[PDB]
Design a protein around this nucleic acid. Structure first.
Lengths: 134, 127
RNA sequence: GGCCGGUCCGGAUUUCCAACGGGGCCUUUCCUUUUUACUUUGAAAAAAUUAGAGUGUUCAAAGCAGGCGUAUUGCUCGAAUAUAUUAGCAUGGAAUAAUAGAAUAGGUUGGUUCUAUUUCUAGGACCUGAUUAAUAGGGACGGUCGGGGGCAUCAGUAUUCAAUUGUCAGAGGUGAAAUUCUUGGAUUUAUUGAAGACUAACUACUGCGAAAGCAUUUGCCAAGGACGUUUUCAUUAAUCAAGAACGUAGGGAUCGGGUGGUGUUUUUUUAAUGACCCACUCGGCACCUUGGGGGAGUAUGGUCGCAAGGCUGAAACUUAAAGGAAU
């Protein structure tokens, strides 16, 4: 296993070429989220197009905070959502052709990786306990 | 592993293989104090604190003074009557090297701890 | 404590500058809403349990006297010191490991009165919380990459079988032989057809997979790695009981991705965006140089063996035939 990560800069009064305001950023963010875009995708879209560095350093607060602050928050965290729907897609594929024991092994690993952050999220209680795999 | 312990392993074996400068991250403040007192006693040389936002990188430049640092796991309480027997079964000889304790009023080695007449729990050692 | 006049020709008046210290004090204005683990003091601590101290018991083991005066209201010393806790007492100081903490902080209707040249206006009620973002982590995304997997499909020439022929004594098989089949024409030759199996040469110290394993084409289904990333979350990590599914450093290359360079292969208004060389980088498979002491023996008056010897026949029978035997 190796490293593949972004290295956010030492600057935090970013970025001094930013002509744009700090309210149109929040406007674009709520536009994209009520268009139905996950936090990662709204971040990358306004990173590329309406070029921000990151909204946590242009606005004073991260985008999950401003999504909750504008009443648009998710009901499950993004990672658990993506990993759940990956689990249901691999389950649908194995249900279609049940001989794929490699998909069985991968499904065991995917469900274990579900249970990891599931019990993490129960211990921190972002989504409430009694919760076990929808 | 710990954060003080691997930094001490780094500056131990790096001068065992005989270099002059080492790097150590994540550089907590107990590492700051721990090699603060050893450059006070003249076992390393000057050291820089590169400060990013993540954790910080301490760069120690050192000559061939030192031969062994080391931490003690776990960190348990010792008395004024105990620090002499800990310097006995922890250092090679008596008046040579030091033993570093987290005392209550500061962070010091054994001789300044018994000079200020305080104690605390044992932290690490260097000779 | 220094710098400036203005009273008079060095004593009183004064401004500013510095150094200490003094006093009122600037910022929750709008809102419901710290203890524990360490160092010092005094009691409670029974001898037998230790050692310390004086003393010529004749010495020593043993034993514990203060004696002298002025034996007068006084001159002087040995029985000075030992865990008696782990469980236990009470008081005062502040790092690290926990722990309270931070009753963590703000920003959608109707009615009242005040306005001058219908403009245009001012005050009530009522109709969701706060570190950084590790060369810790998982997640998204982009272009990819792989004999990774499952399903479907395509291809190949072999092999086997069948058919159609053609020609004639041999043909598989063997170490020889034997055996097998062959004039009902085999083996071989040519043209087809069927069947399932398998993916040669390409194939490497190359690739992928958790391992076992994994090589025809195309399509579909999902998965995975690495890389890229100024994307997001914030310790989600690590390791195995139990259980679950599967059967020392350095160097040269090379694979996968990325960045940059600037020559050739390339081309040009259809979309896509190659190959090579060089450097750097990241990550890979590699390479090169850094259940008991025994055994060999030699011997064995023990102990268990073994070959034992010698014409059979043949003995109670000096006995035949026949067979070795010597010739």
């Amino acid at each position: 296993k190796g490293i593949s990560s972004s290295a956010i800069p030492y600057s935090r009064n970013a970025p001094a070429w930013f002509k744009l305001s700090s309210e149109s950023v929040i406007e674009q963010i709520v536009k994209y989220a009520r268009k139905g875009l996950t936090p990662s995708q709204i971040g990358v879209l306004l990173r590329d197009a309406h070029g921000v560095t990151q909204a946590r350093v242009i606005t004073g607060n991260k985008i999950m905070r401003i999504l909750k602050s504008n009443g648009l928050a998710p009901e499950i965290p993004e990672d658990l959502y993506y990993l759940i729907k990956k689990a249901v897609s691999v389950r649908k594929h194995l249900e279609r052709n049940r001989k794929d024991k490699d998909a069985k092994f991968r499904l065991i690993l995917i469900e274990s990786r579900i249970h990891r952050l599931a019990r993490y999220y129960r211990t921190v209680a972002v989504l409430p306990p009694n919760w076990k795999y929808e | 592993s710990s954060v003080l312990a691997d930094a001490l392993n780094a500056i131990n074996n790096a001068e065992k293989t005989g270099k002059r400068q080492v790097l150590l991250r994540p550089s907590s403040k107990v590492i700051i104090k721990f090699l603060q007192v050893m450059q006070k006693h003249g076992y390393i040389g000057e050291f820089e604190y590169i400060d990013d936002h993540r954790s910080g990188k301490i760069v120690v430049q050192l000559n061939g003074r030192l031969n062994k640092c080391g931490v003690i796991s776990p960190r348990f309480n010792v008395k004024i009557g105990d620090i002499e027997k800990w310097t006995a079964n922890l250092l090679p000889a008596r008046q040579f090297g030091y033993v570093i304790l987290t005392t209550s009023a500061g962070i010091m080695d054994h001789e300044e701890a018994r000079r200020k007449h305080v104690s605390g729990k044992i932290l690490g050692f260097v000779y």
